């Protein structure tokens, strides 16, 4: 593996690693309370034997630049972070894969960047959502305070999240957990669009998902393909991420 640095539109440095391979170039986008280490820890990276893999730390996570403001964590800024990675490696075609809010980011990159040939959204759909301002602000307060890592650990543990997902929370600065949560009130509620007719768009979730309706709506509206994994909830579906990587490798082959 090699490390890289690029700069987002707003000057934020975005750091990541490149795992060379002769195959398709795949760009991995983690979720809010994660960093780039989840790709190896989940077994997703091992599932792609041939791909050239690019894995970034989003702004404010891991080795990337600090942000510490709500608007700095707007969805459009994450999109700019990913597009900067696409620039650095200079390809005409990329396949994007994102977990949870990372999936929403990957879909939005696909909407605006014609270099995205495929986008996979793991446990996030593409539809408009109603975000309660009160509840999100309350969650921001819970996660940014001294008890914030414990709050996330206890909740993810109680909902059956894999250990790597529980453990990743404690690697995120509490201030960036709060800012990223508030950032959701700056654009993340809108639906995503199809970028080009030839794009391959895939949504993945638990067959037990209590709200599959918006995933079906992406099938109809975007022509997306819906993949299911055996799990009673979205969070527990994260235990199947390596298996999903094997299915991605089949598509890339």
Q: Which residues are annotated as a binding site for Zn(2+)?
A: 149
Considering CB distances under 5 to 8 angstroms, the limit depending on partner class, which of Cl ion, Zn ion, ligand MQZ, none binds residue 47?
none
Which residues lie closer than 8 Å to 233 by C-beta, 6 or more apart? 159, 160, 206, 208, 209, 210
Closer of 43 and 103 to Cl ion (Cβ): 103
- Rounded Cα distance between 198 and 187, Å, is 26
- Please state the closest distance from residue 215 (CB atom) to ligand MQZ, in A: 12
Does residue 153 belong to the site contacting Zn ion (CB under 5 A)?
A: no
Secondary-structure breakdown of the chain: helix, strand, coil percentages, each rounded to the nearest 5: 45, 20, 40
Residue nearest to Cl ion (CB): 31
Closer of 29 and 51 to ligand MQZ (Cβ): 29
- Rounded Cα distance between 2 and 90, Å, is 16
Does residue 14 belong to the site contacting Cl ion (CB under 5 A)?
A: no
- Please state the closest distance from residue 208 (CB atom) to ligand MQZ, in A: 10
Considering CB distances under 5 to 8 angstroms, the limit depending on partner class, which of ligand MQZ, Zn ion, Cl ion, none binds residue 149?
Zn ion
- Rounded Cα distance between 127 and 63, Å, is 31
Q: Over the Cα atoms of the chain, what is R_g?
A: 17
- Rounded Cα distance between 9 and 83, Å, is 9
- Rounded Cα distance between 226 and 224, Å, is 6
List of residues contacting ligand MQZ (CB under 6 A): 31-33, 100-101, 104, 124, 129, 131-132, 135-136, 139, 143, 152, 155-156, 159, 181, 184, 188, 234-235
6, 29, 32, 106: residue in contact with Cl ion (rule CB under 5 A): 32
Q: List interacting residues with Cl ion (CB under 5 A).
A: 31-32, 100-101
């Amino acid at each position: 593996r090699d490390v890289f640095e690029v700069f987002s539109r707003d000057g934020t440095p975005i750091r990541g690693f490149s795992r060379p391979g002769p195959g398709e170039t795949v760009v991995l986008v983690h979720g809010v309370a994660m960093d780039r280490r989840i790709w190896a820890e989940s077994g997703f990276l091992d599932a792609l034997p041939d791909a050239h893999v690019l894995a970034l730390d989003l702004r404010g996570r891991g080795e990337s630049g600090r942000v510490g403001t709500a608007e700095g964590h707007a969805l459009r800024r994450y999109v700019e972070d990913v597009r900067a990675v696409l620039d650095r490696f200079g390809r005409a075609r990329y396949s994007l894969f994102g977990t949870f809010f990372g999936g929403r980011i990957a879909l939005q990159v696909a909407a605006v960047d014609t270099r995205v040939a495929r986008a996979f959204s793991f446990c996030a759909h593409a539809e408009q959502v109603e975000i309660p301002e009160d509840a999100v602000e309350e969650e921001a307060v819970a996660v940014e305070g001294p008890g914030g890592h414990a709050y996330l650990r206890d909740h993810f543990t109680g909902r059956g999240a894999p250990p790597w997902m529980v453990e990743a929370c404690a690697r995120v600065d509490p201030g960036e957990l709060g800012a990223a949560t508030r950032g959701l009130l700056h654009g993340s509620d809108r639906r995503t669009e199809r970028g080009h007719p030839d794009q391959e768009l895939v949504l993945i979730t638990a067959d037990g998902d209590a709200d599959l309706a918006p995933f079906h709506a992406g099938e109809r509206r975007l022509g997306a393909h819906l993949w299911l994994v055996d799990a009673p909830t979205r969070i527990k579906a994260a235990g199947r991420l390596a298996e999903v990587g094997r299915r991605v490798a089949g598509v890339l082959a």
